[PDB]
Amino acid sequence: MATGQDRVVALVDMDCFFVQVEQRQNPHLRNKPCAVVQYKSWKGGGIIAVSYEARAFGVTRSMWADDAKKLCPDLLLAQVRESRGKANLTKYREASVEVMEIMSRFAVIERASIDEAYVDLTSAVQERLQKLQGQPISADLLPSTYIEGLPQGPTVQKEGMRKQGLFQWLDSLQIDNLTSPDLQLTVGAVIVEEMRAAIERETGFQCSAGISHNKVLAKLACGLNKPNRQTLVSHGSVPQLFSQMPIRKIRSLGGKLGASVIEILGIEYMGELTQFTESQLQSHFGEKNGSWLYAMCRGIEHDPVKPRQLPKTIGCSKNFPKTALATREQVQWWLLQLAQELEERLTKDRNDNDRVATQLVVSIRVQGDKLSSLRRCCALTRYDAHKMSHDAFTVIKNCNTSGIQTEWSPPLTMLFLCATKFSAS
DNA sequence: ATCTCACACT
DNA sequence: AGTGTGAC
Ligand SMILES: Nc1nc2c(ncn2[C@H]2C[C@H](O)[C@@H](COP(=O)(O)NP(=O)(O)OP(=O)(O)O)O2)c(=O)[nH]1
Ligand SMILES: [Mg+2]
Ligand SMILES: [Mg+2]
């Protein structure tokens, strides 16, 4: 009997992160419809973060600020800082570190993005259980927790509903069994309340969280009640939850694979995968995908929370959409600009994190081509922008089809520098 | 598309 | 090594 109740996993994700960062810094933006964009010289900038007040007006990510202004006239905007003609995300990376370090105090975390991390609470839950000494869990220890699927069976407002569901869960809880998966999830949720409380006290940032037995369910849970709430997804809530859950909502199925699952099998919801054998899914999607899908639709997933808090690579990119680079002098200048930010971030990384990058990856796009046109690596022996930028030029310089030694053809529409292969130092 | 980062696969 | 996908 397959179980998938072996771990306690949480996913903490910051609410409207970039917006919150700007709001802490500028109190005038607090509790208002606001958004964060970069490069306003074109269409007021492209929206990448939206406060929940602004979302009420229908303002979304990927929307032009000028178009967003049509939906929400009083929409306030904070713009991503610009350096060397490029976007600078320094303020946000640093705010992220604040959050990651607080979370790191409770357990080993996997930085999943700039504003979220997975937490393996299995050992931490076990520790708390003996301390409890068979003591019941008060609802007071879960003041922002939702239990998905509850209340059920035999008030109207949301908070009243939340409490009623929480009480049904706690009233039915068997605290006698220290190996009860449902009990383990509850204690995990109590810890996450503490973890989320610590984040807000020490940063001012609010976040949501999902607590379940694996990463996928935890991630899904987190989005069930946003913002400033956490959701517990038990093993038992899975069949109902997945019964009307679109396949695309599940992490990693939001793209071509998920579309392929829908098209080939003629289904719409995650629960509908259960009627197929593992071999069947393997036949359509391969040995690896098939096994993963077979277990996942039953709420089972084994991807571990990796002990990794730091980025594996450090990269900078810029597009050049009639603005395309057509001279060697142009190509060299922008490679230098990219190299300058790269050196800046690398040096700080070396001091902070006791490591040194060893490989420099260069990538370019050509006006005719469809993301990357060419990607080449070279050795990274010194944190020097001039050296790195000259190196970037050298390995790509053979692309220049122009006979004349001053022009570049055909024009470049993207430059990209990435530092990889870190070694301890 | 006028805006980093991980990982499978090769 | 280089390409493609997926998410954020
Ligand atoms: N440059 C760029 N930045 C982005 C993009 N998408 C997101 N960001 C940046 C902006 C975001 O602030 C940050 C976190 O991304 P989320 O967690 O997926 N969205 P948020 O936390 O804002 O809202 P909530 O979580 O409540 O839904 O990543 C993008 O396409 N491009
Ligand atoms: Mg977020
Ligand atoms: Mg996120």
What are the domain boundaries of chain A? 1-15+86-246, 16-85, 247-304, 305-425
Rounded Cα distance, A205 and A200, in Å = 5
Tokens of A190: 């109590």
Alpha-carbon gap, residue A205 to A63, rounded angstroms: 24
Residue A329 is labelled as binding a ligand:
no
Residues A122, A240: Cα–Cα separation, whole Å = 25
Nucleotides of C under 7 A from a protein CB: 1-8
A247-304 and A305-425 in the same fold: no
**CA–CA distance, A148 with A153 (Å, rounded to integer):** 14
Structure tokens of A176? 């006698």
Nearest ligand, CA of residue A18?
1
List bases in chain B with any atom under 7 Å of a protein Cβ.
1-9
Tokens linked to A340: 């300058």
Residues 6+ apart with CB under 8 A from A351: none
DSSP code per residue over A151-192: S-----SHHHHHHHHHHHHHHH--TT-TT-HHHHHHHHHHHH
Query: Strands of A46-50's sheet, edge to edge?
Result: A46-50, A34-38, A76-79
Atom 20 (ligand 1) nearest CA: A16
Q: How many Å apart are A252 CA and B7 C1'?
A: 11
Identify the burial level of A306 via C-beta atoms within 10 angstroms of its C-beta, where 0-12 means exposed, 13-18 middle and 19 or more buried: middle
Distance A339 CA to ligand 1 centre (A): 26
DSSP track, A192-211 = HHHHHHHHHHHH---EEEEE
Tokens of A210: 């999902």
Query: Closest residue (by CA) to atom 26 of ligand 1?
Result: A15
Q: Which residue from A114, A222, A224 has its CB within 8 A of the most atoms of ligand 1, so it is best to mutate?
A: A114
Architecture of the CATH domain A305-425: 2-Layer Sandwich (3.30)
Gap between the Cα atoms of A14 and A18, Å rounded: 9
Identify the CATH assignment for A247-304 out of 1.10.150.20, 1.10.10.10, 3.40.50.300, 3.40.50.1820.
1.10.150.20
Nearest-angstrom CA–CA distance, A384 and A346:
10
Q: How many CB atoms lie within 10 A of CB A123?
A: 12
Element (H, E) at A26: none
Instruction: Say whether the CB atom of A377 is under 7 angstroms from strand C.
Output: yes
Q: In CATH, what class is A1-15+86-246?
A: alpha beta
Which CATH number is A16-85's, of 3.30.1360.120, 2.40.160.210, 3.90.1150.10, 3.40.1170.60?
3.40.1170.60
Q: Which ligand is nearest to the CA of A117?
A: 3
Judge whether A118 and A11 are in contact, CB under 8 Å. yes
Ligand 1, residue A61: give the atom nearest the CA. Answer: 6
Interatomic CA–C1' length for residue A12 and nucleotide C8, angstroms? 14
Which ligand 1 atom is at minimum distance from the Cα of A15?
Answer: 26
Residue A176 labelled as part of a binding site:
no
